[PDB]
């Protein structure tokens, strides 16, 4: 199953295998039973060149998995800065909202990726967006002791 092989190659960082599978007709938008696509997996793992070649070969920058998360959510949650930048240029919504109300800025602020927080703000990240529990990105930065991020978010309020 070329889809299954492509998902695995994208997750584990096998760039040559990704290129070979797509040349052999692997569905660039294949999904597993959690709705993760090769682009989700490369974005979460941090494989920049794979993310680029998937987007060049027709990967869906807006695809949502079973949590409603886009590849930008996953790169933002992990701290993969160059991937966040490439996804925004390629058409990602900076304020894509998952099924429990997280934006990429919620996840960056919570886990504590300062440089990602700065890049998301420059692309119109919404500081007022509330998750399912009423929490803003600032609320989550305070709750997880990310002081420098809370300061940056307060200045952007």
């Amino acid at each position: 199953d070329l889809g299954k092989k492509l998902l695995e190659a994208a997750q584990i960082g096998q760039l040559d295998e990704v290129r070979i599978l797509m040349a052999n007709g692997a569905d660039v938008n294949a999904s597993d039973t959690d709705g993760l696509t090769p682009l989700h997996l490369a974005a979460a793992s941090g494989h920049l060149e794979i993310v680029e070649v998937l987007l060049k070969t027709g990967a869906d920058v807006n695809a949502t998995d079973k949590w409603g998360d886009t590849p930008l959510h996953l790169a933002a949650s992990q701290g993969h800065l160059e991937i966040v930048e490439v996804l925004l240029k390629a058409g990602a919504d900076v304020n894509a909202t998952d099924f429990t109300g997280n934006t990429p800025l919620h996840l960056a602020a919570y886990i504590g990726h300062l440089e990602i927080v700065e890049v998301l703000l420059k692309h119109g990240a919404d500081v007022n967006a509330q998750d399912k529990f009423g929490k803003t990105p600032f609320d989550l930065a305070i709750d997880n002791g990310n002081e420098d991020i809370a300061e940056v978010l307060q200045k952007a309020a």
Partner: protein
């Protein structure tokens, strides 16, 4: 006989904790204090902090053993799926047997145990006190299969049981946390916390 998961501080006030974030260049792991749940990517370094209030005896060891969380699974031994066991990835010539889910990183005296009666697999390190002027003993763990792996854990949740033991295998202390080996630790932690 099922391994006990009961928390037991014991006479040395044994406790297991996690630093506030990965010192990796990305969220290779993250720990939920709300859910007492570690989230990590496959084979990444996971530092776990051990604290005691009085020195353990000479010869004490720290064991880490994975067990299934749900009563319907707990009798099944937790090991790597065949695909990861037989992969060449991470399986270069080394002390850890390739079936073991839990490895220790950076300790030549880590010992891989398979009980010849129960078939349970675990990994030991000698207990060492903290380096002078630190609070914690750090043990580096690696978790060598995804929670989702169909030939192994197959989306069943696991607990990591951390036991402080005498040389002769008497329990001195025990702490337990849930572990998930997943694609995106940062998202999975928030999603799980959101769900509860």
């Amino acid at each position: 006989a099922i391994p006990s998961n009961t928390d037991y501080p014991g006479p040395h006030s044994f406790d297991v904790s996690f630093q506030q974030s990965s010192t990796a260049k990305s969220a290779t792991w993250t720990y939920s204090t709300e859910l007492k749940k570690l989230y990590c990517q496959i084979a990444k370094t996971c530092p776990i902090q051990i604290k005691v209030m009085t020195p353990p005896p000479q010869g004490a060891v720290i064991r880490a053993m994975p067990v299934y969380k749900k009563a319907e699974h707990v009798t099944e031994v937790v090991k790597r799926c065949p695909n990861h066991e037989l992969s060449r990835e991470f399986n270069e010539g080394q002390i850890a047997p390739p079936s073991h889910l839990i490895r220790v990183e950076g300790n030549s005296h880590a010992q891989y145990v398979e009980d010849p009666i129960t078939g349970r697999q675990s990994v030991l390190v000698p207990y060492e006190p903290p380096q002078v002027g630190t609070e914690f003993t750090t043990v580096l763990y690696n978790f060598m299969c995804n929670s989702s792996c169909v030939g192994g854990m197959n989306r069943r949740p696991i607990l990591i049981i951390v036991t402080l033991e005498t040389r002769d295998g008497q329990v001195l202390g025990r702490r337990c946390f849930e572990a998930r080996i997943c694609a995106c630790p940062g998202r999975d932690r928030k999603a799980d916390e959101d769900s509860i």
